[PDB]
Amino acid sequence: AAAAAAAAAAAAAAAAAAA
Amino acid sequence: PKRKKNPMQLRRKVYGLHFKEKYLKMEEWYYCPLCAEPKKPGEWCRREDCRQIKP
Amino acid sequence: KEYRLTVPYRSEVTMLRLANHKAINSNIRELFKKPLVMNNIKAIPRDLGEIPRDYVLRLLF
Amino acid sequence: GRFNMDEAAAALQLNPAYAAALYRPLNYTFHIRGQLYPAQKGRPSRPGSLAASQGRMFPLYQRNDRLDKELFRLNSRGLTTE
Amino acid sequence: GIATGGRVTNEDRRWWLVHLECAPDVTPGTFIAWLDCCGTHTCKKLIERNIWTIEQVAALDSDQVDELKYREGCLKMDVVWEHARTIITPLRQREV
Amino acid sequence: VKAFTCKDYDELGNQFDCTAFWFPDNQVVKHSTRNGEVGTDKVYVGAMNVPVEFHKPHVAAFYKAAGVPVKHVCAGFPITPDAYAPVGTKLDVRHFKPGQEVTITFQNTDYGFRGVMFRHGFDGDSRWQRRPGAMGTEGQKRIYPGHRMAGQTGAAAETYQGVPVWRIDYKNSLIYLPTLLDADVGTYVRFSDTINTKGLTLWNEHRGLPAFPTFIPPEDEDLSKLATDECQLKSPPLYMYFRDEFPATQLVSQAD
Amino acid sequence: ALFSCFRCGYMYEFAVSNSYCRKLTLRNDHCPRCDQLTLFRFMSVSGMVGNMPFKPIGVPGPSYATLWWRKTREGKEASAPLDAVCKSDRW
Amino acid sequence: YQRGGWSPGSKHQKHMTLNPTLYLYRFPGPHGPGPYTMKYWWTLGCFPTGMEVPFRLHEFLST
Amino acid sequence: SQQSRGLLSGSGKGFSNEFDWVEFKNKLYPSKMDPRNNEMGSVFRRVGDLGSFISTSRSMER
Amino acid sequence: YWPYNEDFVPEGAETSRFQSSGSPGTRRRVLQEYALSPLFGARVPCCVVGTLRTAKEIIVLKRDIQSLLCELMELPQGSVTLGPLQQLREMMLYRHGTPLSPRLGDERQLNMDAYARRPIAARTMMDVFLAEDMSLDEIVNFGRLSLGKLQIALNNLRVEPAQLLVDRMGISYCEIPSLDESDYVFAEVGGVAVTDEEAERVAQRWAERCE
Amino acid sequence: PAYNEDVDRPMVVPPDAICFNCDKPIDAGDVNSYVWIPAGQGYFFHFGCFKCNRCKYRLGHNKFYSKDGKAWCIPCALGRDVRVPTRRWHTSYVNTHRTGSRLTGHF
Amino acid sequence: GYTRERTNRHFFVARANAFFSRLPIARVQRSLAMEAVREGRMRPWKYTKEQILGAPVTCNFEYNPRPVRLIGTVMDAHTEETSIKGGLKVYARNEETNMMLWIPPGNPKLRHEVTSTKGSFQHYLDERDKWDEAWITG
Amino acid sequence: MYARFTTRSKFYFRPARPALAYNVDPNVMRRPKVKRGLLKGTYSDETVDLRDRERLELLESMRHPRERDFYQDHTYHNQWLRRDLEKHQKQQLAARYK
Amino acid sequence: RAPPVIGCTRKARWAGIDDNPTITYKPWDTTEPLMADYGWTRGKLPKFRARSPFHRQQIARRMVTEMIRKDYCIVGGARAPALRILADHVVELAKAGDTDSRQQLAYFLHDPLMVDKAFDEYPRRFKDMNAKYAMMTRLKSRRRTDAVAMYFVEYKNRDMSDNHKGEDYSAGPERFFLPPRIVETEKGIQRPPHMQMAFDRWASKFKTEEFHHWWRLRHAKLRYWGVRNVPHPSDVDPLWTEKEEEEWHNEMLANT
RNA sequence: UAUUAUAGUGUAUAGUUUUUUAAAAAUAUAGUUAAAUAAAGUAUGAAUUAAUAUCAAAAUUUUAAUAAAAAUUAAAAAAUUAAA
Ligand code: FES
Ligand SMILES: [Zn+2]
Ligand SMILES: [Zn+2]
Ligand SMILES: [Zn+2]
Structure with a gap:
């Protein structure tokens, strides 16, 4: 979950950028 | 994950002490002299009087 | 997940390294390391012109 | 009078709607493909509630055909050849 | 010195006298910060009071010590005052 | 109580990492015996005074019944009848001697739940055939009770045996032992007197005799009339030679 | 870090803490040479606020450019005309 | 792969190959709609799966 | 009477408090959406500089 | 990884001396002189007065307390001196014997047949000294007289300086603490025995320098 | 490397920087859309004017050949007949305000 | 569980850290330091790191048969005032030997004396550089 | 000190109640029409169901914040497909309008 | 001689301190006011959960900044004592008032305006206060989210405080962007003009309508993500209206 | 509603805004020689498995292949965590 949270946050940032 | 359990094998946990401490505990409390609400010692409100003097 | 980013007081060098945002005066090394499509770093404009040619000719002479 | 987007647009000789589109996401003000949350889409009128629509719950985020045609789509006359 | 507990004692005074030797260059006019247990706050308050030297600190009085330690917020002002009082006379003799 | 730690030096160039233990108000709190059985005589000694509100009700009741001033801690010592001292007696640090041997019982510092690498970390036969004559063996069908395994390592009643005494300071009631304990500051250590060593007896005419039953200070002396440096008893050297070098027998050349 | 006025080129040094991470590459400040609020561009790194664990303070190290700038502004030759005006150690 | 019954209400695990199914996020059980499905019913107007057909004839008659 | 009122309508520990649900005009909200405080657990904190003006001197968030 | 950077001391900067001289013999001799030197900040206290109030309240009345004590001890005005006001720690868990411990109402020598001490009776303390020329016997007599007068004042409380101190000033404790014998009897300095003639010579030198 | 240190040379853009092709001033205060190349000397181009002065097309290799004070693309300069580009014609694909040229410089 | 590892007896669970204020630890330690001074195993010292760093120290270790005589600098000092919990670092350099050693005070056999009344930080720096080079080469 | 607790065989093993053959109760004609709840001892002065719109807010408040419900406004499967109803719903429709 | 356990060894969470001579390594000058190491040892502040020490430092900065902005702050879990100690350190910096101290506080905090506010008001507010400048009450209401104890961390001497005087925090105002409630007997107080202007500028942002659109969009976002009690953006109403x-x-105007 | 930008074109300061928690084991990352992150608990709640009587301490001996199958002998507490 440790690295998974950071990965999910980065994915959310990328999705917000691409939306 | 190898064999089914029977009611007594399940009730061993309630026989134990950890189950009672985790589930079957009664809290000691009193009526706060200021707000007259149920209250446990060591925990108070955010009201000004409670913050200044802690019942 | 890097030690430098984990340090309680992030160093200025690491901060600059992380400063890879696509903006004016952003780090060029990180953008170049990133994929070409992701960034917008295009070919370096150079002047293969008469004045440089003359300068090189003078130096060669 | 601290600062206003309309005042800045007037000072710079720009369109307030254009400034709003610039400073708000592209999908809201232009005919472009972008994620839209289902709640924004709205729902009809239920027995104990009135109808909901983007035109009433997000008037500012609505698209603008005038600006979209001015900026994105070409004009046929500007390229007409004959 | 700095570790003195509660009151000061002849043991601490003798310790200060012994270390006077280890501090040769000290003069009665030396800056107050050399005093043991004189913190930044204490020396700032002494400067505000216009006390600038060990001689003046020793020349202070009980009322000034009390108003420094209990109204100016200084801590261990009694300790620094005792240090200065115990050390001034050897310093004066050294200066002479 | 374990007061602090320091470093001292022998008459030779030997350095000892001494642990200084503070002995607060100590008194014989109780006498016990299991129906008069021989050898069961025990003396319970207090450690340090304490307010009334400090202890639990039953501990306070025990001290009230004893009549001795309330003590934070109370230890017990099996003794012989001749060694009895009246309840309420005052014990001074001079009860011991600078050079004797003391048994130290204390609680180790708690390291919590640790793995095998930390505790028991290094990183018989039942039945088997020595010759190929036959085939008979007995394999291991379970975990034997003695099996070094991960568990709670830490707090535990440890007991150093025969630690020599190094220095007694009866003005401040301190005893310095030339060793370092794996215990936290403030632990109530228990000091006993080692009874033998290397086939000999600690107390004897060759070495000396103790203040049996305990040390009773004289009347004229007043500890409040003595300085801290006038009330210290240093032990004779524990080693015979300078441990940096070798004994003169094993030494190539000696200066004398 | 060193920050240089976009137009003037006047350079000033100021270490940046973690609280101002998004203002290292670019800044906005009142340049002295031009009496207007101007953009400042990052040029070199001086040293982080605080220190990393279990290392001396200056382990990250100022950049060579920052060291050269500081030497030019406070060196023997630079200090010679001014040191006479007032000893840099005292008043 | 397959361990319990083929119906969605069966408890134990299934696999896509043997018992392929549609993505039913949350549907009632053998004992009738639960509080969660009923909350979906009242808020969204239908069960979250969407495959169910809304039927509030009794509510209409009542009100 | 005050004791009974406190027992009934008193803010219980773990529920019916300012951290469990916050009653807006007529609606229940989670504590994070409470419009009565932009605490560290409030969504209002994460907003800032909508486009009009900076509105705050701090330059790290918002 | 060295603790000190190259600029820990300013470049080309002098450093102050930290010992008298490099010669061990003269260093030891100076150490002996200083160790055998008499204490200069030592002042035996005539009597330690104590109040149940706080320092921020007693500082105002400090001068009045001094005048009242001088009147009580029947001495010329201004003859007595007051040491720094010392507020004893507000210990949650009382610990008798510590210098910063609120003095109790009584003592075992006063009530031997008591199963506990009387509650706290002093949270701030202040030493009272006389002229240094006063003899030890005179100091003891003055302290005992003051203690007796204050005890009588308290007892009758349960005009005169004692009554004024007890009622107005508020002091409710006074003691005559033992002498500070923590001083060192330097019979050997640096491993060299201190001869009686040498000690007398050092004392004479210090007396001459002081005079 | 990144952020080419400019201590020795401040690397500032004068207000009166003239476009290398159309010979008109550049106002860096308004926008940074212009194209700057230090090459430390200094070259300035308008984004539109960056095209070859002869064929008015982009530069395939992003390199030009100054001639008579004007920038001519490599084909035109070398004499090979200009071949019309396919991907794009009137641009240059260069990055504005030295961003495409900050890679090289003095350190 | 045939054995136990933790003790919950009051005697062991009790701690006297609350009552520790009754005994002055610092005064006792300073008295021990003064006793060492009187015995002569060490002399009092009140120096700061800036003042002492780089000062020359002569070390006479009374080994046998020939006492060891060394001259070095002061790389570091543990404490700034006389105390048993002290210690001082030295960098002795013989003909072909470069030994950096920590010497504690109060030892009757290791007579270490700072032979100068002051030290030079530049000397400390260059000596430290020499030691670093020697250590790296080794 | 502690509350008495006993694991319930009812929760351990709860077989389904017997079904009806041909929707026939075997002893309907033999038993009274009294409510089996009343004759067994189960009675309620105020029955409350949390599945109602009135108690929806109470149910939501009781539910913990951490448990999340996703398809609050949209749905995965398209809901504008002409599909059938449940058998009991169809039977109710037929009975209501035969 | 060497101790039994050699080297820096991690002990139990609640373990005593032993003076055994061991080489002590500190990451930096922990004595610095705002640069304090986080750990479960008694000499360190408690380390509340974070994704990294950098994230913990960021959380500490945010908490301190919020405390300065509004003295009272409600923080959950182990971060409450850390926030209290950091607030005390900030007060110490303000009382010191040195330019270096101000620059250090500027480095630490996120808001230079709050740095100035602290250095302006805290000196006079805590001139008469010695050590403890922040109080930490414990709230009997635990966060429903993760059931973590909540602590009300507040500054003391509010009456002496200039910009925060007569403020009662028994209940927050009607809107988070409105000035905090004022005691009835302290209704005539007037705040510093600079702080008042800053607060007004901050509140205007929320007074804008684009904030209302953002609020409705947040309703939509949470509804999509899964937060249950998020009323539909059709039913939601603006926080701010003309009346x-x-x-x-x-x-x-009345409160001034 | 997932590792995860679908990139054609195209551009470079829009802060274009959802990742709990007060320790420890284990696991993953992280001045000799050739110290960070992931807890229980509140809340939600799967999966392999399931002949089994409230269960099979242990040793000895033996019976048709592991034999907790048999017999003899003996003495096996409950809960919690970890350990193959
Ligand atoms: S009134 Fe009861 S907690 Fe405050
Ligand atoms: Zn400028
Ligand atoms: Zn041009
Ligand atoms: Zn061309």
Whole structure:
């Protein structure tokens, strides 16, 4: 979950950028 | 994950002490002299009087 | 997940390294390391012109 | 009078709607493909509630055909050849 | 010195006298910060009071010590005052 | 109580990492015996005074019944009848001697739940055939009770045996032992007197005799009339030679 | 870090803490040479606020450019005309 | 792969190959709609799966 | 009477408090959406500089 | 990884001396002189007065307390001196014997047949000294007289300086603490025995320098 | 490397920087859309004017050949007949305000 | 569980850290330091790191048969005032030997004396550089 | 000190109640029409169901914040497909309008 | 001689301190006011959960900044004592008042305006206060989210405080962007003009309508993500209206 | 509603805004020689498995292949965590 949270946050940032 | 359990094998946990401490505990409390609400010692409100003097 | 980013007081060098945002005066090394499509770093404009040619000719002479 | 987007647009000789589109996401003000949350889409009128629509719950985020045609789509006359 | 507990004692005074030797260059006019247990706050308050030297600190009085330690917020002002009082006379003799 | 730690030096160039233990108000709190059985005589000694509100009700009741001033801690010592001292007696640090041997019982510092690498970390036969004559063996069908395994390592009643005494300071009631304990500051250590060593007896005419039953200070002396440096008893050297070098027998050349 | 006025080129040094991470590459400040609020561009790194664990303070190290700038502004030759005006150690 | 019954209400695990199914996020059980499905019913107007057909004839008659 | 009122309508520990649900005009909200405080657990904190003006001197968030 | 950077001391900067001289013999001799030197900040206290109030309240009345004590001890005005006001720690868990411990109402020598001490009776303390020329016997007599007068004042409380101190000033404790014998009897300095003639010579030198 | 240190040379853009092709001033205060190349000397181009002065097309290799004070693309300069580009014609694909040229410089 | 590892007896669970204020630890330690001074195993010292760093120290270790005589600098000092919990670092350099050693005070056999009344930080720096080079080469 | 607790065989093993053959109760004609709840001892002065719109807010408040419900406004499967109803719903429709 | 356990060894969470001589390594000068190491040892502040020490430092900075902005802050879990100690350190910096101290506080905090506010008011506010400047009450209401104890961390001497005087925090104001409630007997107080202007500028942002659109969009976002009790953006209503604006303007004029 | 930008074109300061928690084991990352992150608990709640009587301490001996199958002998507490 440790690295998974950071990965999910980065994915959310990328999705917000691409939306 | 190898064999089914029977009611007594399940009730061993309630026989134990950890189950009672985790589930079957009664809290000691009193009526706060200021707000007259149920209250446990060591925990108070955010009201000004409670913050200044802690019942 | 890097030690430098984990340090309680992030160093200025690491901060600059992380400063890879696509903006004016952003780090060029990180953008170049990133994929070409992701960034917008295009070919370096150079002047293969008469004045440089003359300068090189003078130096060669 | 601290600062206003309309005042800045007037000072710079720009369109307030254009400034709003610039400073708000592209999908809201232009005919472009972008994620839209289902709640924004709205729902009809239920027995104990009135109808909901983007035109009433997000008037500012609505698209603008005038600006979209001015900026994105070409004009046929500007390229007409004959 | 700095570790003195509660009151000061002849043991601490003798310790200060012994270390006077280890501090040769000290003069009665030396800056107050050399005093043991004189913190930044204490020396700032002494400067505000216009006390600038060990001689003046020793020349202070009980009322000034009390108003420094209990109204100016200084801590261990009694300790620094005792240090200065115990050390001034050897310093004066050294200066002479 | 374990007061602090320091470093001292022998008459030779030997350095000892001494642990200084503070002995607060100590008194014989109780006498016990299991129906008069021989050898069961025990003396319970207090450690340090304490307010009334400090202890639990039953501990306070025990001290009230004893009549001795309330003590934070109370230890017990099996003794012989001749060694009895009246309840309420005052014990001074001079009860011991600078050079004797003391048994130290204390609680180790708690390291919590640790793995095998930390505790028991290094990183018989039942039945088997020595010759190929036959085939008979007995394999291991379970975990034997003695099996070094991960568990709670830490707090535990440890007991150093025969630690020599190094220095007694009866003005401040301190005893310095030339060793370092794996215990936290403030632990109530228990000091006993080692009874033998290397086939000999600690107390004897060759070495000396103790203040049996305990040390009773004289009347004229007043500890409040003595300085801290006038009330210290240093032990004779524990080693015979300078441990940096070798004994003169094993030494190539000696200066004398 | 060193920050240089976009137009003037006047350079000033100021270490940046973690609280101002998004203002290292670019800044906005009142340049002295031009009496207007101007953009400042990052040029070199001086040293982080605080220190990393279990290392001396200056382990990250100022950049060579920052060291050269500081030497030019406070060196023997630079200090010679001014040191006479007032000893840099005292008043 | 397959361990319990083929119906969605069966408890134990299934696999896509043997018992392929549609993505039913949350549907009632053998004992009738639960509080969660009923909350979906009242808020969204239908069960979250969407495959169910809304039927509030009794509510209409009542009100 | 005050004791009974406190027992009934008193803010219980773990529920019916300012951290469990916050009653807006007529609606229940989670504590994070409470419009009565932009605490560290409030969504209002994460907003800032909508486009009009900076509105705050701090330059790290918002 | 060295603790000190190259600029820990300013470049080309002098450093102050930290010992008298490099010669061990003269260093030891100076150490002996200083160790055998008499204490200069030592002042035996005539009597330690104590109040149940706080320092921020007693500082105002400090001068009045001094005048009242001088009147009580029947001495010329201004003859007595007051040491720094010392507020004893507000210990949650009382610990008798510590210098910063609120003095109790009584003592075992006063009530031997008591199963506990009387509650706290002093949270701030202040030493009272006389002229240094006063003899030890005179100091003891003055302290005992003051203690007796204050005890009588308290007892009758349960005009005169004692009554004024007890009622107005508020002091409710006074003691005559033992002498500070923590001083060192330097019979050997640096491993060299201190001869009686040498000690007398050092004392004479210090007396001459002081005079 | 990144952020080419400019201590020795401040690397500032004068207000009166003239476009290398159309010979008109550049106002860096308004926008940074212009194209700057230090090459430390200094070259300035308008984004539109960056095209070859002869064929008015982009530069395939992003390199030009100054001639008579004007920038001519490599084909035109070398004499090979200009071949019309396919991907794009009137641009240059260069990055504005030295961003495409900050890679090289003095350190 | 045939054995136990933790003790919950009051005697062991009790701690006297609350009552520790009754005994002055610092005064006792300073008295021990003064006793060492009187015995002569060490002399009092009140120096700061800036003042002492780089000062020359002569070390006479009374080994046998020939006492060891060394001259070095002061790389570091543990404490700034006389105390048993002290210690001082030295960098002795013989003909072909470069030994950096920590010497504690109060030892009757290791007579270490700072032979100068002051030290030079530049000397400390260059000596430290020499030691670093020697250590790296080794 | 502690509350008495006993694991319930009812929760351990709860077989389904017997079904009806041909929707026939075997002893309907033999038993009274009294409510089996009343004759067994189960009675309620105020029955409350949390599945109602009135108690929806109470149910939501009781539910913990951490448990999340996703398809609050949209749905995965398209809901504008002409599909059938449940058998009991169809039977109710037929009975209501035969 | 060497101790039994050699080297820096991690002990139990609640373990005593032993003076055994061991080489001590500290990451930096922990004595610095705002640069304090986080750990479960007694000499360190408690380390509340974070994704990294850098994230913990960021959380500490945010908490301190919020405390300065509004003295009272409600923080959950182990971060409450850390926030209290950091607030005390900030007060110490303000009382010191040195330029270096101010620059250090500027480095630490996120808001230079709050740095200035602290260095302006805290000196006079805590001139008479010695050590403890922040109080930490414990709230009997635990966060429903993760059931973590909540602590009300507050500054002391509010009466001496200039910009925060007569503020009662028994209940927050009607809107988070409105000035905090004022005691009835302290209704005539007037805040510093600079802080008042800063607060007004901050509140205007929320008074804008684009904030209302953002609020409705947040309703939509949470509804999509899964937060249950998020009313539909059709039913939600703006936080700020014209009648409410004029009523609150009258209230602000009355309070001054 | 997932590792995860679908990139054609195209551009470079829009802060274009959802990742709990007060320790420890284990696991993953992280001045000799050739110290960070992931807890229980509140809340939600799967999966392999399931002949089994409230269960099979242990040793000895033996019976048709592991034999907790048999017999003899003996003495096996409950809960919690970890350990193959
Ligand atoms: S009134 Fe009861 S907690 Fe405050
Ligand atoms: Zn400028
Ligand atoms: Zn041009
Ligand atoms: Zn061309």
